[PDB]
Amino acid sequence: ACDYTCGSNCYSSSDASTAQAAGYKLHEDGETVGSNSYPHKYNNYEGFDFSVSSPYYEWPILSSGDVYSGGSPGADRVVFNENNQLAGVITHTGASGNNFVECT
Ligand SMILES: Nc1nc2c(ncn2[C@@H]2O[C@H](CO)[C@@H](O)[C@H]2OP(=O)(O)O)c(=O)[nH]1
Ligand SMILES: [Ca+2]
């Protein structure tokens, strides 16, 4: 079973932790990758009720299992905070425009 289901993409807790670890390191080093400059601040326009405090940052999580290193980000993202705590896994899949919905 999936710990996080983003549209049709299936992720385990280990997949999320791995992506988060990569995103947080770039965050700490002040580096970004990709045309959308990931990781970057997640403003939470959606108003999701995360259990951890902000600021929030988003980083792509890939269905391929690989760690994001540039190129197409896909529709899924892991959201983490300044304390390197996982806030949630969200996706553009099933959401209108550039909005996000949480992965179930
Ligand atoms: N939907 C959404 N987009 C956000 C949020 N925070 C930042 N963004 C960014 O704001 C713009 C919305 O059009 C995009 O550049 C989007 O980046 P991503 O596409 O990389 O997520 C957020 O909380 N919700
Ligand atoms: Ca996996």
Side-chain angles (χ1 to χ4, degrees):
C2 311
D3 290 308
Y4 299 103
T5 301
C6 299
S8 67
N9 293 317
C10 188
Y11 299 113
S12 63
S13 298
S14 58
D15 295 314
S17 299
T18 297
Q20 175 186 172
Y24 192 69
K25 181 174 180 56
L26 282 296
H27 173 60
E28 295 187 300
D29 301 322
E31 293 180 56
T32 58
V33 60
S35 294
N36 306 320
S37 297
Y38 291 113
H40 71 251
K41 186 176 300 180
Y42 179 68
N43 299 298
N44 190 28
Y45 301 141
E46 286 62 32
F48 294 125
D49 272 299
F50 297 130
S51 61
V52 301
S53 60
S54 57
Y56 300 123
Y57 297 100
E58 59 169 297
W59 171 259
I61 179 173
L62 308 176
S63 59
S64 62
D66 294 61
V67 173
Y68 184 67
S69 57
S72 183
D76 316 321
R77 309 280 183 279
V78 289
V79 180
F80 60 82
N81 68 15
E82 204 65 60
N83 295 169
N84 192 189
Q85 293 176 295
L86 182 62
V89 181
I90 60 180
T91 181
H92 285 304
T93 302
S96 55
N98 292 179
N99 292 169
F100 286 109
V101 290
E102 296 186 5
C103 300
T104 55

